[PDB]
Design a protein around this ligand. Structure first.
Ligand SMILES: [Os+3]
Ligand SMILES: [Os+3]
Lengths: 108, 114
């Protein structure tokens, strides 16, 4: 068993930190990442052939969709099916943070 | 794409010979997810998920409060902002020794169900 404070993980888009908290180094099936998006930060719209499972931990996250956008806040979860267009933007003055998990096929 | 408030998922009371004072939400389940499941557990004050093991891993992120982790031997406390990886078939359990509810995310691969 591994027990650790997330922020202590060294990080691996604009104005992002990406931490792989539980990577395939340790885990057999899926990966736990922590994303910190600075004010004005951006993860461009993209597509990958694997799903995302996300939990918004802090702040107000703009979710970029195939068409248009939606804003969610801390305490929201997000499921993105494989190949669905998605991106993320921080349109606030405050740090945004979210947990993001992907299956092994997505690497880290 | 699904975007929803976690708390809006109806929590189910979990009550077994080895679990007391616990509620569980399945946030992203096998209805939607092809590979692994996102749960949110709420442990009331004094609540207990006693030591057990399963042939699948857990990936945990603590959302709220101080979580006492029962390890193969002894215990260790973590808090909001900690993650936990539990290997398959490793003994583990959880206890809430505080006076307020503790919450954590807990993800398992599909072979573990929901
Ligand atoms: Os993506
Ligand atoms: Os378990």
């Amino acid at each position: 068993m591994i027990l650790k404070r997330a922020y202590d993980v060294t990080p691996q888009v604009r104005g992002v930190r990406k931490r792989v908290l539980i990577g395939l180094k340790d885990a057999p099936n899926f990966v736990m990442r922590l994303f910190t998006v600075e004010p004005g930060g951006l993860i461009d719209r993209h597509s990958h052939p694997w799903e995302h499972e996300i939990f918004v931990l802090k702040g107000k996250l703009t979710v970029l969709k195939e068409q248009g956008e939606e804003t969610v806040e801390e305490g929201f979860y997000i499921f993105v099916e494989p190949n669905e267009i998605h991106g993320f933007r921080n349109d606030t003055d405050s740090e945004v943070e979210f947990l993001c998990l992907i299956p092994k096929e997505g690497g880290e």
